[PDB]
Amino acid sequence: SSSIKVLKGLDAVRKRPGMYIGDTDDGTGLHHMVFEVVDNAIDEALAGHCKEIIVTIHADNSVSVQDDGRGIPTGIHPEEGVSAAEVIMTVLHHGVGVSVVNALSQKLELVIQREGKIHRQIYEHGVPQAPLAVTGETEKTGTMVRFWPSLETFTNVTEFEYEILAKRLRELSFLNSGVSIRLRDKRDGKEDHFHY
Ligand SMILES: CNc1cc(F)cc2c(NCCCN)c(C(=O)Nc3ccc(C(=O)O)cc3)c(=O)[nH]c12
Numbered sequence: 001s002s003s004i005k006v007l008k009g010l011d012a013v014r015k016r017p018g019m020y021i022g023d024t025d026d027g028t029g030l031h032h033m034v035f036e037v038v039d040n041a042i043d044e045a046l047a048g049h050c051k052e053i054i055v056t057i058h059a060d061n062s063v064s065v066q067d068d069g070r071g072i073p074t075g076i077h078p079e080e081g082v083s084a085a086e087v088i089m090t091v092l093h094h095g096v097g098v099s100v101v102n103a104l105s106q107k108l109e110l111v112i113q114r115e116g117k118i119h120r121q122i123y124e125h126g127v128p129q130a131p132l133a134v135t136g137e138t139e140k141t142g143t144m145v146r147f148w149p150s151l152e153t154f155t156n157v158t159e160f161e162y163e164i165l166a167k168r169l170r171e172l173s174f175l176n177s178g179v180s181i182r183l184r185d186k187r188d189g190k191e192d193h194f195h196y
Helices: 002-015 028-046 084-090 098-103 162-175
Strands: 052-057 063-067 105-114 117-124 133-137 142-149 180-185 191-194
Touching: 002 084, 002 098, 028 052, 028 063, 028 098, 028 142, 028 162, 052 162, 084 098, 084 105, 084 117, 098 105, 098 142, 162 180, 162 191
Parallel strands: 052 180
Antiparallel strands: 052 063, 063 142, 105 117, 105 142, 117 133, 180 191
């Protein structure tokens, strides 16, 4: 039931993205993709587990958001029969849910560090290539989401603008005293640190 429901939700978002992420021509939807993923990292900070968020603009026009929180739970739900992480990445929940970013990404990479293991999963248009898998051991904890926005969905403004991410991250750091945000642009080495 869940599998059918999930695919219906992905289809819904790709068919009417304006209802979920906003305008797909003028860059507002595109930048909103980053801000949704960051809002999830900020929740993990607000719960008191994440101290540092790192937002990176990569040279291939993907964006990663790294937190140093607990790591999304990885245990297979008895019910849905896939990792708790995969449910969070794929089930449809301002505040539109990461499954919307995933639906509208050509590719999404999830890396979770939790209970001494690295877990990794790759998505394409919100669909998992394979179940979440352990790739190594680690002493660290946290969640990293890197996504490549679908050029089927986004036109015209397709490249992230440093200033637009900077303004919003600075604003989120003002609203959430104590959270520390790094923004780094791999295209030219620019970086900023936002903290109130
Ligand atoms: C870049 N970071 C990042 C991106 C992202 F797209 C999603 C998340 C995310 N879940 C999203 C749903 C909620 N707002 C969590 C989360 O669920 N953490 C979390 C939840 C429960 C437990 C536990 O019960 O043990 C431990 C950790 C997180 O930490 N970081 C995220």
